[PDB]
């Protein structure tokens, strides 16, 4: 019961740092050796922070229109005291370049480790919609 | 060094059970609560074994043509003594319905847990090519 | 006779609160645990009010052009004293971005429950046209 | 707890009578005044059994290939002692006219009433895939 | 009440004579000066029986596969003792040239007159699907 | 001879009230229970005046360009002293958004009843061109 | 009255000689200097019988499937005692190469002269469908 | 010889009244019961002057750019003292909306009668290009 | 009068030698220095007989189906006693590979010279349809 | 030798009068009974000067951009003392509506007669490019 | 005069060795260091005989259907006593895979040198049609 | 060795005169009887200077943007003391109408003769890209 | 001079082992750590022999039709006594599935090292055509 | 270990000189005889610096928007003391002409030689994306 709810809590804090363009908070949540699969990387496994830094600097820190995000049907696996995995469906509501409301879907997996009494993200996999909305 | 190589060993034993259509060996490797994201499930999170059983019975146990599989650039995260995560690129070589050799690519993540001294799979995510080849 | 007409009355009061962008009246008509199937949710079952709040804030409270709505062939099922179901065809007449009159169709089911002597909506299903008109 | 599980039980017994082409069992589960929205009815509300009887006689009682069905994320509303509503996502796995395995999705709502101590279906709404698979 | 039901009765007897290819029964129901608008006449008003006789002789008397017909939402206007008008939606279920079940829709108006104590059809208008199904 | 000419007279007075956008004259010609089939209603039977009121308010009372209308080959059925039916082809000549003259065709049926010594319209069916011209 | 009916009589006798492939009867009805506009002549004015003789020899005398023809709304101009003109719409019902019934339309003008007490055709113009049906 | 040349003379005077937009001269040349087949009438036979009056008022009396017309290969049939028929190919040269010279073709039949010592047109048939040029 | 008719006579004798595949008669009609423009020569001026000999040997001497040819509106220029030019429209009626009758058009110019008291062809130009029909 | 060069001389003087828009010089070179085949006449044989006068007045006398013309491979037939024929390929270089240089090709035949000691053109045939360039 | 005709003679002997598939005669005509530009070499300069040997062995020595070749407008440059260049247009007539006669065009340049008293080919360039006909 | 390098030297001096629009230098390099095959001449052999003069006057003397040219793999044949042939691949780098750098390819053959102690060009053949770049 | 020719010799021996399907000779030429870029590997760097073994077993050892290969413009870099690099264009001539001769192009780089007195291949890069021909 | 890291160091210094448009630093890193395969050269092997100089002058020295580059999975072969080869995947992140972030991929091989104690590049091969981004 209580152990699964803190993995939901850290996952929601991560997603809001990305919404705000808050790269300084986002960098505290990630392990420096973090790896990623996502639609922007063209089928390659990316490692470290500098691929994501470009989207913070050239996009996410600049934009300011309303967005709403929903997490659907989260499933949590707990792998002892120091490791967890979460999988969920993500729906995004956003405003397009004509001012009309639109919707998109992605499927996401996140893997969490507990060094030094702090939860940090070690691997991420994303399917479906790109992170940049087609406004 | 030695701990990462046994996660490669169990991952290669899993992939060959699927190639052989060996559902009885495959069922020993999986946790009964296993969850999955894959191209056949249309963006839904599937749970348990019975969605996969259909592909064993109606396809993988029947087919017999030559296939070759390559694992490229595997990255392993070790999360204490009892948990691990592996991510890799998979290339498949197969023969089409005209008899011509063809190639396809997928991106895969697998999450492993160590109950009772035996490694078992708890979550899987797949991107790119479907598991049924377009022969 | 008289019991079916008050289910038509609450259904017509609901549709007009949406036409007016009156989120404060709409929130009194809905159970807090309300679930929905609709074309905007991409085949997912949505729960609660916050998915709909976005369309009130970014669209329905802002727009002001003439719209007319017709309810065709309503069928009512009465399931004791405290529960009812209504199903109907909905035609919408609206003005497009060039100023021309246009028409669209949807099929709708609504499920009603009577806690505390007040009728409240518990589930909704929609087919056909989206709620945002293609002006 | 226990009351929601018998609404899942009757819903699973209904779906299997349709899979088997068992019109005599299906006719005991339905109220004679049953209404329906579905993709085959071209946006019209159908009433009674004779629209469905045609698919039993000309299709479902004749076919015999393997099919598998999954119910995802069922949500149940209980509306006193004698009424209930269930909503879920349905995945179908089937074999096509070339012998290849395929998958399709629908969204379904079912409304249940308890006359004479027996649960019977009074209204049904379906979205997404047709009931006849595109083999 | 009772007067509207005999206009439904004659309308259902007319439609079944066409289903059976029974030109001798159909010719007793029609006034010899009958006029028609229908999709086969290319936007022209047809008069008399000989345009319809061709579809009896070359098609409707020859075919023998299962068909089912539904009349939806019939509205009846009664214009004294000797005249009536009926309007309705018609759904047809039929088997195609591959043996698959299919559905089509038309909108129909029929005008009835009561010479010599017998109801006879004087004008007909049809919209939507052709009378020959696209098998 | 003389009885058919007054059904042509009322039909021509109806069409000119629509050309002028004169909803107050049009409302005197129609029975309050009037039903309609037309291309704007998407295959549904409409009842009463309020579906048509929208086209008077948002279009027909606003527009002012030249239009010419021709009634071709009218056929009249007389069904005693108090009822009649008329069927005809309608050609419309109008000016488009570039200022060029254009032509369109429809097929129309109108049913007339004589309550209180005044002819009133009880049912209407239209095929072919929409009532809003594609300027 | 009676003079217009014999121009309808000769026009119906002409059309049936073409249906039968009876070139010997057709040649008695035509003036030897007859001229023609028709879709087969590619926008050229043809003169005499030998252009039409080819369709008798290579087609109309060989074919034997059922055809039905309707003359709609014939208008007759009478130009003294010895000359007349007739204009009408022609509908053809025929069976295609798959055995299905089909319909086509043409517009026709015929000019008649009365040498030697016998009516003969001097000019013909045709629009719309070709004389060879697209079976 | 001389009788055919006055039918060419009246035909050339008719075509120039249309070029000039001179409806008052055109109305003296036509019989009040004149009938027409032409591309603008959508396959219908038109009667009288008011269909043509619209093209005089909204187009032919307004336009003023250069046009040239050629009559090719005129064939004349003379049907006693009081009736004639003429058939010909018509080529039109005109300037488009970009200022470029363009060409179009039609095929025309005209039927002439001699009441009261004045030649008047009783029927007209046109094929090929519309009378409104595609500038 | 009489001089133009012998240029029509030699032109008709030439066209029939080509229809028959009679290269020995065709070679007597042509000057050995004959030049040609035609659709088969891809925009090049051909000289002599050997380009045409290939169509006699590989096509025109082998084929045997019915063909009919019409010469329309021939214009003849006479350039003294020993030279003439003829220009005309040619219509061909032929049977296609399915057995259906078809029509095609060409425009032709022929230049004639009178050495040794015999008319011979010195130049030819063709536009429109190819000489090989698209059967 | 010398006789062929004066037919080249008159042909080059004709082409330059058309380039200059010099209708008064062009009219001295042509016989009043001149006939023509060309791409602008839609497959019809034109006679006289007035079809060409329109292109002088509305185009060739107005335009002023650079054009260059080449005559390739001219072949001359000499038919006594008073008649000649010339055939050649014509290449035109011109500037388009964007200012870019472009090229087009035509095939041309010209027939010359020598009345009154002056060479005049009696017939012309053109294939390939139109005379109006697609600028 | 006489020197240009022997360059035409060797060029015609070369083309016939290729038509016959006579690689042994063709190899005597070519310098061993011969270079080529042609459509089969994909924009590359080829050197020597072995690229051409493949078309002799796998095609030109096997085929046996009728072909005819024309050389148009040959231009010869003579560069002293021992060197020449020839340029010409080539038309090929051939029979396709359905048995129909077809035509194609190429542009060709050939460079000739006179070692040891024998003319031999040193360079070749080809444009337009491929050497393998599209049968 | 040294003799091949002066044929490269004259070829590079020719290409730069064209780049500069220097028609006066270009005219000294060419024989007055020069012939050409190139993409602008539509498959015709051109002779002399005036076809090329148009591209100097209307284009090459006007333009001024940066261009770079590369000669790849030049092959030289030497045909005594007074004649040579050169063949090469040409790559052009240029700036388009949006300011972006682009690349194109051609294949070129040039034939050189040595009258009066000066090398002059006698024939040219070009394949691939046009000389006017698609900016 | 002599050192570059033995790198051409080993490169030609490698290409012929692949043509013959001689995997046992091919395996002696390659370093066991060999890496590859090629069109079949979908943009991935492959390592070792087993990716290539599949094309030997399922294709190259089975096929037997004629193929010819040309190496164009080879450039060799020599990097001391024990290392070399070669780059070239490769043209392949082959017979398709209809028996027609076809051509394809690739660009290739090969890197050679001299361990133990034997030249072995350490890296390969390929662009353009796939190694499996599109027969 | 240490020897492979200085080949990564020189490769990263090369890529940054190109990013900066620093042709003077780039020219010190390259051997004057450098050869290249790349997408801009249309399948040709380029030699020397002047093909690349054009992209420095007309593009890379002018542009100034943000770009980020990643080197993935570099593999290094060491071929004695004085020669090395490196192969890698390159990902580029850039801003398009609308200001949106975009990604592209290439595959690259570089060959390094150590004359005079300084590493210099001797050959380069590139596949996938062009070096000019499609902004």
Numbering used by the authors:
A (entry chain J), B (entry chain E), C (entry chain I), D (entry chain F), E (entry chain G), F (entry chain H), ...: 408 to 542
Give excerpts from the publication.
The calcium calmodulin protein kinase II (CaMKII) is a multi-subunit ring assembly with a central hub formed by the association domains. The AD hub, which evolved from bacterial dimeric enzymes, extends the β sheet to form lateral contact interfaces (LCs) needed for ring assembly, while the ancient dimer contact was preserved as the vertical contact interface (VC) in the mirror-symmetric two-stack hub. Linkers with variable length and sequence between isoforms and developmental splice variants, connect each AD with a peripheral kinase domain (KD). Here, we present near-atomic resolution cryogenic electron microscopy (cryo-EM) structures revealing that hubs from the α and β isoforms, either standalone or within an β holoenzyme, coexist as 12 and 14 subunit assemblies.
Cryo-EM maps of 12-mer (2.6 Å resolution) and 14-mer (2.6 Å resolution) were also obtained for the β-isoform. The superimposed structures of the 12-mers between α-isoform and β-isoform had a root mean square deviation (RMSD) of 0.35 Å, while that for the comparison of the 14-mers between the two isoforms is 0.3 Å. The 14-mer hub structures from the β holoenzyme and the isolated β hub superimposed with an RMSD of 0.52 Å. Parallel simulations on tetramers extracted from the β 12-mer (β12T) and 14-mer (β14T) hubs gave mean RMSF values (β12T = 0.11 ± 0.02, β14T = 0.11 ± 0.01) comparable to α14T (0.09 ± 0.03). In contrast, the tetramer δ angular distributions extracted from the 12-mer and 14-mer hubs have substantially broadened distributions relative to the narrow distributions of the 12-mer and 14-mer parent hubs. The δ angular distributions for the parent hubs are well-resolved from each other, whereas the tetramer distributions were superimposable with a mean δ angle intermediate between the mean values for the parent hubs. Importantly, they suggest that the 12-mer and 14-mer have comparable stability as their δ angle curvature deviates slightly higher or lower, respectively, from the most stable δ angle determined from the unconstrained tetramer sub-assemblies. We constructed an open ring hub in-silico by extraction of a vertical dimer from the β 14-mer hub, We simulated this assembly for 100 ns following analogous simulations reported for the human 12-mer γ hub.
